[PDB]
Amino acid sequence: DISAKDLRNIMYDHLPGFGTAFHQLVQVICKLGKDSNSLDIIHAEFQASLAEGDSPQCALIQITKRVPIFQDAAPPVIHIRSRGDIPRACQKSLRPVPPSPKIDRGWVCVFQLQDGKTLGLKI
């Protein structure tokens, strides 16, 4: 069976740049997919979207809209020490956390900083 690491690497293979918000979205998709035994359907949706001619970015967003574990789901909370732990290419995508963020509305994750600060990653 495909593993979370395998799928992460497969998805990364299609993305430009490094440590971008889409890379973090792959991390989130793979974590939540692993936790709900859904990596196979996620991989299949990813490949099908690519096969129809969608960009890999569009394919990842479509996974957040078409795979049921992400539908109306809140972004996962990831504990980090400070803003510096977040990759450079993600920094401009960090935003104040809104009232009810949802993964399928583009809120990838919420970083909970050691000093109590909180930042959402937005696509």
Ligand X SMILES: O=C(O)c1cccc(N2C(=O)C(O)=C(C(=O)c3cccc(C(F)(F)F)c3)[C@@H]2c2cc(Cl)c3c(c2)OCO3)c1
Positions in the binding site for ligand X (CB under 6 A): 4, 24, 27-28, 30-31, 34, 76, 78, 80, 85-87, 109
CB closer to ligand X, 53 vs 81: 81
- Find the shortest distance in angstroms from Cβ 36 to ligand X: 12
Strand order in the sheet with 118-122: 77-80, 107-113, 118-122, 94-95
Two tokens, residue 25 = 């979205």
- Find the shortest distance in angstroms from Cβ 21 to ligand X: 10
CB closer to ligand X, 50 vs 78: 78
The count of other CB atoms within 10 Å of the CB of residue 22 is: 24
Going by C-beta distance under 8 Å and a sequence separation of 6 or more, which residues neighbour residue 7?
A: 30, 33, 39, 42, 43
- Find the shortest distance in angstroms from Cβ 34 to ligand X: 5
